[PDB]
Coordinates of N, CA and C and ligand atoms in Angstrom, one line a residue:
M1 N 89.4 74.3 107.2 CA 88.6 74.4 108.5 C 88.0 73.1 108.9
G2 N 87.8 72.2 108.0 CA 87.2 70.8 108.2 C 87.9 69.9 107.1
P3 N 87.5 68.6 107.2 CA 88.1 67.6 106.3 C 87.8 67.9 104.7
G4 N 86.7 68.5 104.4 CA 86.5 69.0 103.0 C 87.6 69.9 102.4
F5 N 88.0 70.9 103.3 CA 88.9 72.0 103.0 C 90.3 71.3 103.2
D6 N 90.5 70.4 104.0 CA 91.8 69.6 104.2 C 92.1 68.9 102.9
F7 N 91.2 68.1 102.3 CA 91.5 67.5 101.0 C 91.7 68.5 99.8
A8 N 90.9 69.5 99.7 CA 91.1 70.6 98.7 C 92.5 71.1 98.8
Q9 N 93.0 71.6 100.0 CA 94.2 72.3 100.2 C 95.4 71.3 99.8
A10 N 95.2 70.0 100.0 CA 96.2 69.0 99.8 C 96.4 68.9 98.3
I11 N 95.2 69.0 97.5 CA 95.4 69.0 96.0 C 96.0 70.4 95.6
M12 N 95.5 71.6 96.1 CA 96.0 72.8 95.6 C 97.5 73.0 95.8
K13 N 98.0 72.5 96.9 CA 99.4 72.9 97.3 C 100.5 72.0 96.6
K14 N 100.0 70.9 96.0 CA 101.0 70.1 95.2 C 100.6 70.1 93.7
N15 N 99.4 70.2 93.3 CA 98.9 69.8 91.9 C 98.2 71.0 91.2
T16 N 98.6 72.2 91.5 CA 98.1 73.3 90.7 C 99.3 74.3 90.3
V17 N 99.1 74.9 89.2 CA 100.0 76.0 88.7 C 99.1 77.1 88.3
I18 N 99.7 78.4 88.1 CA 99.0 79.5 87.6 C 99.3 79.5 86.1
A19 N 98.3 79.2 85.2 CA 98.4 79.2 83.7 C 98.0 80.6 83.2
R20 N 98.8 81.2 82.4 CA 98.5 82.5 81.7 C 98.5 82.2 80.2
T21 N 97.3 82.5 79.6 CA 97.2 82.6 78.1 C 96.9 84.0 77.7
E22 N 96.7 84.2 76.4 CA 96.2 85.6 75.9 C 94.8 85.8 76.4
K23 N 94.1 84.9 76.9 CA 92.6 85.0 77.5 C 92.7 85.2 79.0
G24 N 93.8 85.3 79.6 CA 93.9 85.5 81.0 C 94.6 84.5 81.9
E25 N 94.6 84.7 83.2 CA 95.1 83.7 84.2 C 94.0 82.7 84.6
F26 N 94.4 81.4 84.7 CA 93.5 80.3 85.0 C 94.2 79.5 86.1
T27 N 93.4 78.8 87.0 CA 93.9 77.7 87.9 C 94.1 76.6 86.9
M28 N 95.2 75.9 86.9 CA 95.4 74.7 86.1 C 95.8 73.5 86.9
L29 N 95.0 72.4 86.9 CA 95.3 71.3 87.7 C 96.3 70.3 86.9
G30 N 97.3 69.9 87.6 CA 98.3 68.9 87.1 C 97.9 67.6 87.5
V31 N 97.9 66.6 86.6 CA 97.3 65.3 87.0 C 98.4 64.2 87.2
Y32 N 99.4 64.2 86.3 CA 100.5 63.2 86.4 C 101.5 63.7 85.4
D33 N 102.8 63.2 85.5 CA 103.9 63.5 84.7 C 103.9 65.0 84.4
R34 N 103.8 65.5 83.1 CA 103.8 66.9 82.7 C 102.4 67.3 82.1
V35 N 101.5 66.5 82.5 CA 100.1 66.5 81.9 C 99.1 67.3 82.9
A36 N 98.4 68.2 82.4 CA 97.6 69.2 83.1 C 96.3 69.5 82.3
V37 N 95.2 69.9 83.1 CA 93.9 70.2 82.4 C 93.7 71.8 82.6
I38 N 92.9 72.3 81.7 CA 92.4 73.7 81.8 C 91.1 73.9 80.9
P39 N 90.2 74.8 81.3 CA 89.0 74.9 80.4 C 89.4 75.2 79.0
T40 N 88.7 74.7 78.0 CA 89.0 74.9 76.6 C 89.0 76.4 76.3
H41 N 88.1 77.1 76.9 CA 88.0 78.6 76.5 C 89.2 79.4 77.0
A42 N 90.2 78.8 77.7 CA 91.5 79.5 77.9 C 92.3 79.7 76.5
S43 N 91.9 79.0 75.4 CA 92.6 79.0 74.2 C 94.1 78.8 74.3
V44 N 94.5 77.6 74.7 CA 95.9 77.2 74.9 C 96.6 77.2 73.5
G45 N 97.7 77.8 73.3 CA 98.5 77.8 72.0 C 99.9 77.1 72.2
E46 N 100.8 77.5 71.5 CA 102.1 76.8 71.4 C 103.0 77.2 72.5
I47 N 102.8 78.3 73.2 CA 103.4 78.8 74.3 C 102.5 79.3 75.4
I48 N 102.7 79.0 76.6 CA 101.8 79.3 77.7 C 102.8 79.7 78.9
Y49 N 102.3 80.6 79.8 CA 103.1 80.9 81.0 C 102.6 80.1 82.2
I50 N 103.5 79.5 82.9 CA 103.2 78.6 84.0 C 104.0 79.2 85.2
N51 N 103.2 79.7 86.2 CA 103.9 80.4 87.3 C 104.8 81.5 86.7
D52 N 104.4 82.2 85.7 CA 105.1 83.3 85.0 C 106.4 82.9 84.3
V53 N 106.6 81.6 84.0 CA 107.7 81.0 83.2 C 107.2 80.7 81.8
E54 N 107.9 81.2 80.9 CA 107.5 80.8 79.5 C 107.8 79.3 79.2
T55 N 106.8 78.6 78.7 CA 106.7 77.1 78.7 C 106.2 76.7 77.3
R56 N 107.0 75.9 76.5 CA 106.5 75.3 75.2 C 105.4 74.2 75.6
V57 N 104.3 74.2 74.8 CA 103.2 73.3 75.0 C 103.6 72.1 74.0
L58 N 103.8 70.9 74.6 CA 104.2 69.7 73.8 C 103.1 69.1 73.1
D59 N 101.9 69.3 73.6 CA 100.7 68.8 73.0 C 99.4 69.4 73.7
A60 N 98.3 69.4 73.1 CA 97.1 69.9 73.7 C 95.9 69.3 72.8
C61 N 94.9 68.9 73.6 CA 93.7 68.3 73.0 C 92.4 68.9 73.7
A62 N 91.6 69.5 72.9 CA 90.2 69.9 73.3 C 89.4 68.7 73.3
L63 N 88.9 68.2 74.4 CA 88.2 66.9 74.6 C 86.7 67.0 74.1
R64 N 86.2 66.0 73.4 CA 84.8 65.9 73.0 C 84.4 64.4 73.4
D65 N 83.2 64.2 73.7 CA 82.6 62.9 73.9 C 82.4 62.2 72.6
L66 N 82.1 60.9 72.6 CA 81.9 60.1 71.3 C 80.7 60.5 70.5
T67 N 79.8 61.3 71.1 CA 78.7 61.9 70.4 C 79.1 63.2 69.6
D68 N 80.5 63.5 69.7 CA 81.2 64.6 69.0 C 80.6 65.9 69.7
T69 N 80.4 66.0 71.0 CA 79.9 67.1 71.7 C 81.0 67.6 72.6
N70 N 81.2 69.0 72.7 CA 82.2 69.6 73.6 C 82.1 69.1 75.0
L71 N 83.2 68.8 75.7 CA 83.4 68.6 77.1 C 84.0 69.7 77.8
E72 N 84.6 70.8 77.1 CA 85.1 72.0 77.6 C 86.4 71.8 78.5
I73 N 87.1 70.6 78.4 CA 88.4 70.4 79.1 C 89.4 70.3 77.9
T74 N 90.5 71.0 78.1 CA 91.7 70.9 77.2 C 92.7 70.2 78.1
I75 N 93.3 69.1 77.7 CA 94.4 68.4 78.3 C 95.7 68.9 77.6
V76 N 96.7 69.3 78.4 CA 98.0 69.9 78.0 C 99.1 69.1 78.6
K77 N 100.0 68.7 77.6 CA 101.4 68.3 78.0 C 102.4 69.5 77.9
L78 N 103.1 69.8 79.0 CA 103.9 71.0 79.2 C 105.4 70.5 79.1
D79 N 106.2 71.3 78.4 CA 107.7 71.1 78.4 C 108.2 71.7 79.6
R80 N 108.0 71.0 80.8 CA 108.5 71.5 82.1 C 109.5 70.5 82.6
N81 N 110.3 71.0 83.5 CA 111.4 70.2 84.0 C 111.0 69.5 85.3
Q82 N 109.8 69.4 85.7 CA 109.3 68.8 86.9 C 108.0 68.1 86.7
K83 N 107.8 67.0 87.3 CA 106.6 66.2 87.2 C 105.6 66.6 88.3
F84 N 104.3 66.4 88.0 CA 103.3 66.5 89.1 C 103.2 65.2 89.9
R85 N 102.9 65.3 91.2 CA 102.4 64.2 91.9 C 101.3 63.5 91.1
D86 N 101.3 62.2 90.8 CA 100.2 61.5 90.2 C 99.0 61.3 91.0
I87 N 97.9 62.0 90.7 CA 96.6 62.0 91.5 C 95.5 61.4 90.6
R88 N 95.8 60.5 89.6 CA 94.8 59.8 88.8 C 94.0 58.9 89.6
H89 N 94.5 58.4 90.7 CA 93.7 57.5 91.6 C 92.6 58.3 92.5
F90 N 92.6 59.6 92.4 CA 91.5 60.4 93.1 C 90.4 60.7 92.1
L91 N 90.5 60.3 90.8 CA 89.5 60.7 89.8 C 88.4 59.7 89.8
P92 N 87.1 60.1 89.7 CA 86.1 59.1 89.6 C 86.1 58.3 88.2
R93 N 85.6 57.1 88.2 CA 85.5 56.3 87.0 C 84.3 56.6 86.2
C94 N 83.2 57.0 87.0 CA 81.8 57.1 86.3 C 81.2 58.6 86.6
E95 N 80.3 59.0 85.8 CA 79.5 60.2 85.9 C 78.7 60.0 87.3
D96 N 78.6 61.0 88.1 CA 77.9 60.9 89.4 C 77.4 62.3 89.9
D97 N 76.6 62.2 91.0 CA 76.2 63.4 91.8 C 77.0 63.2 93.1
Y98 N 77.2 64.4 93.9 CA 78.1 64.3 95.0 C 77.4 65.2 96.1
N99 N 77.9 65.1 97.3 CA 77.5 65.9 98.5 C 78.8 66.7 98.8
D100 N 78.6 67.9 99.5 CA 79.6 68.6 100.2 C 80.9 68.6 99.3
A101 N 80.8 69.4 98.3 CA 82.0 69.7 97.4 C 82.6 71.1 97.9
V102 N 83.8 71.2 97.5 CA 84.7 72.5 97.6 C 85.2 72.8 96.2
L103 N 85.1 74.1 95.9 CA 85.7 74.8 94.7 C 86.9 75.6 95.1
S104 N 88.1 75.2 94.6 CA 89.4 75.8 95.1 C 90.1 76.5 93.9
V105 N 90.5 77.7 94.1 CA 91.1 78.6 93.0 C 92.4 79.2 93.6
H106 N 93.4 79.4 92.6 CA 94.7 80.0 93.0 C 95.2 80.8 91.7
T107 N 95.0 82.1 91.8 CA 95.6 83.0 90.7 C 96.3 84.2 91.5
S108 N 96.9 85.0 90.7 CA 97.6 86.3 91.2 C 96.6 87.1 92.0
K109 N 95.4 87.2 91.4 CA 94.2 88.0 91.9 C 93.5 87.2 93.0
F110 N 93.2 85.9 92.9 CA 92.5 85.0 94.0 C 93.5 83.9 94.5
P111 N 94.5 84.2 95.2 CA 95.3 83.2 95.9 C 94.6 82.5 97.0
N112 N 94.8 81.2 97.2 CA 94.4 80.5 98.5 C 92.9 80.6 98.8
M113 N 92.0 80.6 97.7 CA 90.6 80.7 97.8 C 89.8 79.3 97.8
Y114 N 88.9 79.1 98.7 CA 88.2 77.8 98.9 C 86.8 78.2 99.0
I115 N 85.9 77.5 98.4 CA 84.4 77.9 98.4 C 83.7 76.6 98.7
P116 N 82.9 76.6 99.8 CA 82.0 75.4 100.0 C 80.8 75.6 99.2
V117 N 80.7 74.8 98.1 CA 79.6 75.0 97.1 C 78.4 74.1 97.4
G118 N 78.6 73.0 98.2 CA 77.5 72.1 98.7 C 77.2 70.9 97.8
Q119 N 76.0 70.7 97.5 CA 75.5 69.5 96.7 C 76.0 69.7 95.2
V120 N 76.5 68.7 94.6 CA 76.7 68.7 93.2 C 75.8 67.8 92.4
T121 N 75.2 68.3 91.5 CA 74.2 67.6 90.5 C 74.9 67.2 89.2
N122 N 74.7 66.0 88.9 CA 75.0 65.5 87.5 C 73.9 66.2 86.6
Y123 N 74.3 67.3 86.0 CA 73.2 68.1 85.3 C 73.2 67.5 83.9
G124 N 74.4 67.2 83.2 CA 74.4 66.6 81.9 C 74.6 67.6 80.8
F125 N 73.7 67.7 79.8 CA 73.7 68.8 78.7 C 73.5 70.1 79.3
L126 N 74.4 71.1 78.9 CA 74.2 72.5 79.1 C 74.6 73.2 77.8
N127 N 73.8 74.2 77.4 CA 74.2 75.2 76.3 C 75.1 76.3 77.1
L128 N 76.3 76.1 77.0 CA 77.4 76.8 77.8 C 77.9 77.9 76.9
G129 N 77.5 79.2 77.2 CA 78.0 80.3 76.3 C 77.8 80.0 74.8
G130 N 76.7 79.4 74.5 CA 76.3 79.1 73.2 C 76.8 77.8 72.6
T131 N 77.6 77.0 73.4 CA 78.2 75.7 73.0 C 77.5 74.6 73.6
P132 N 76.8 73.6 72.8 CA 76.4 72.5 73.5 C 77.5 71.8 74.2
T133 N 77.3 71.4 75.5 CA 78.3 70.8 76.3 C 77.7 69.7 77.1
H134 N 78.5 68.6 77.2 CA 78.0 67.3 78.0 C 78.9 67.2 79.3
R135 N 78.4 66.3 80.2 CA 79.1 66.0 81.4 C 79.3 67.2 82.4
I136 N 78.3 68.1 82.4 CA 78.3 69.3 83.3 C 77.8 68.9 84.7
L137 N 78.6 69.3 85.7 CA 78.2 69.3 87.1 C 77.7 70.7 87.5
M138 N 76.6 70.8 88.3 CA 76.1 72.0 88.8 C 76.0 72.1 90.3
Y139 N 76.4 73.3 90.8 CA 76.3 73.6 92.2 C 75.6 75.0 92.4
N140 N 74.9 75.2 93.5 CA 74.2 76.5 93.8 C 75.1 77.4 94.6
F141 N 76.0 78.0 94.0 CA 76.9 79.1 94.5 C 77.0 80.1 93.3
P142 N 76.9 81.4 93.6 CA 77.2 82.5 92.8 C 78.6 82.8 92.4
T143 N 79.3 81.9 91.5 CA 80.6 82.0 91.1 C 80.8 83.2 90.1
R144 N 82.1 83.8 90.1 CA 82.4 85.0 89.4 C 83.6 84.8 88.6
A145 N 83.8 85.6 87.5 CA 85.0 85.5 86.6 C 86.2 85.6 87.5
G146 N 87.3 84.9 87.0 CA 88.5 84.6 87.8 C 88.4 83.2 88.4
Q147 N 87.3 82.5 88.5 CA 87.2 81.2 89.1 C 87.3 80.0 88.1
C148 N 87.4 80.3 86.8 CA 87.4 79.3 85.8 C 88.7 78.5 85.9
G149 N 88.6 77.1 85.9 CA 89.8 76.2 86.0 C 89.9 75.8 87.5
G150 N 89.1 76.5 88.3 CA 89.0 76.1 89.8 C 88.7 74.7 89.9
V151 N 89.3 74.0 90.9 CA 89.2 72.5 91.1 C 88.0 72.2 92.0
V152 N 87.2 71.3 91.6 CA 86.0 70.8 92.5 C 86.4 69.4 93.1
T153 N 86.3 69.3 94.4 CA 86.8 68.2 95.2 C 85.6 67.8 96.2
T154 N 85.5 66.5 96.5 CA 84.9 66.0 97.7 C 86.0 65.6 98.6
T155 N 85.7 65.0 99.8 CA 86.7 64.3 100.5 C 87.0 63.1 99.7
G156 N 88.2 62.9 99.2 CA 88.8 61.7 98.6 C 88.8 61.8 97.1
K157 N 87.9 62.7 96.5 CA 87.8 62.7 95.0 C 88.0 64.1 94.4
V158 N 88.8 64.2 93.2 CA 88.9 65.3 92.3 C 87.9 65.0 91.2
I159 N 86.7 65.8 91.3 CA 85.5 65.5 90.4 C 85.5 66.4 89.1
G160 N 86.0 67.6 89.2 CA 85.8 68.5 88.0 C 86.5 69.8 88.1
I161 N 86.4 70.6 87.0 CA 87.1 71.9 86.9 C 85.9 72.9 86.5
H162 N 85.9 74.1 87.2 CA 84.9 75.1 87.0 C 85.1 75.6 85.5
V163 N 84.0 75.7 84.8 CA 84.0 76.3 83.4 C 83.0 77.4 83.2
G164 N 82.0 77.7 84.1 CA 81.1 78.8 83.9 C 80.2 79.0 85.0
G165 N 79.2 79.9 84.7 CA 78.1 80.1 85.7 C 77.1 81.1 85.2
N166 N 76.0 81.4 85.9 CA 74.9 82.2 85.4 C 74.5 83.3 86.4
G167 N 75.3 83.5 87.5 CA 75.1 84.4 88.5 C 74.5 83.8 89.8
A168 N 73.7 82.7 89.6 CA 73.2 82.0 90.8 C 73.8 80.6 90.9
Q169 N 74.2 80.0 89.8 CA 74.7 78.6 89.8 C 76.1 78.6 89.0
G170 N 77.0 77.6 89.5 CA 78.3 77.3 88.8 C 78.2 76.0 88.1
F171 N 79.1 75.8 87.1 CA 79.1 74.6 86.2 C 80.5 74.2 86.1
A172 N 80.8 72.9 86.3 CA 82.1 72.3 86.2 C 82.0 71.2 85.1
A173 N 83.0 71.0 84.3 CA 83.2 69.9 83.4 C 83.8 68.7 84.3
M174 N 83.1 67.6 84.2 CA 83.6 66.4 84.9 C 85.0 66.0 84.6
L175 N 85.8 65.5 85.6 CA 87.0 64.8 85.3 C 86.8 63.3 85.5
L176 N 87.2 62.5 84.6 CA 87.1 61.0 84.7 C 88.4 60.4 84.5
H177 N 88.5 59.3 85.2 CA 89.8 58.5 85.3 C 90.2 58.1 83.8
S178 N 89.3 57.7 83.0 CA 89.5 57.3 81.6 C 90.1 58.4 80.7
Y179 N 90.1 59.7 81.1 CA 90.7 60.8 80.3 C 92.2 60.7 80.4
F180 N 92.8 60.1 81.4 CA 94.3 60.1 81.7 C 94.9 58.7 81.8
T181 N 94.3 57.7 81.2 CA 95.0 56.4 81.0 C 96.3 56.8 80.2
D182 N 97.4 56.4 80.7 CA 98.8 56.9 80.4 C 99.0 56.8 78.9
Ligands
U3C201 C1 85.7 85.1 73.7 C2 85.1 83.8 73.1 C3 85.5 83.5 71.8 C4 85.0 82.4 71.2 C5 84.1 81.6 72.0 C6 83.8 82.0 73.3 N1 83.2 81.2 74.2 C7 82.5 80.1 74.0 O1 82.3 79.4 73.0 C8 82.1 79.4 75.3 C9 81.1 78.3 75.3 C10 81.7 77.3 76.0 C11 82.6 78.0 77.1 N2 83.0 79.3 76.5 N3 84.3 83.1 73.8

């Protein structure tokens, strides 16, 4: 409807797939080559469904910071016959706060969903479902199950993926450029 939603749609329509694990359907962001991200709590195994196609997982890493604290991002390399548009140049280099963010989700259940979540806070530490978690972004929107893996964008930047919420607020794990140095 405006430039915020224009940037979000541009990411969703080229750089997401529907990922299915035994824990459910997730919005999965593709970053470059056959490399994609998903919340760690999706529990990625050796085989994953990608747009309902059985797909071997070539590698997967649940990321932690150098303090050995959970980041709640799993980076997946997919045995797929097609590369993602390379969007690594939209990723921020540093931890930050933002204005005017959009949370965008695409599953069988929530296709073509865009939420204007507003101001994004560099919240930092959160006890997320009993897991100490670092580099958490917070927005004041009442997010619901089905939105995990949702992409958080400003105009010009892909800043994070939705990983949880408490009924009043939503929580995203930061994406940083340094996660995807080739
Ligand atoms: C069903 C299940 C099994 C094991 C662990 C969990 N969840 C967690 O640890 C959290 C904290 C970080 C995000 N999800 N949930």
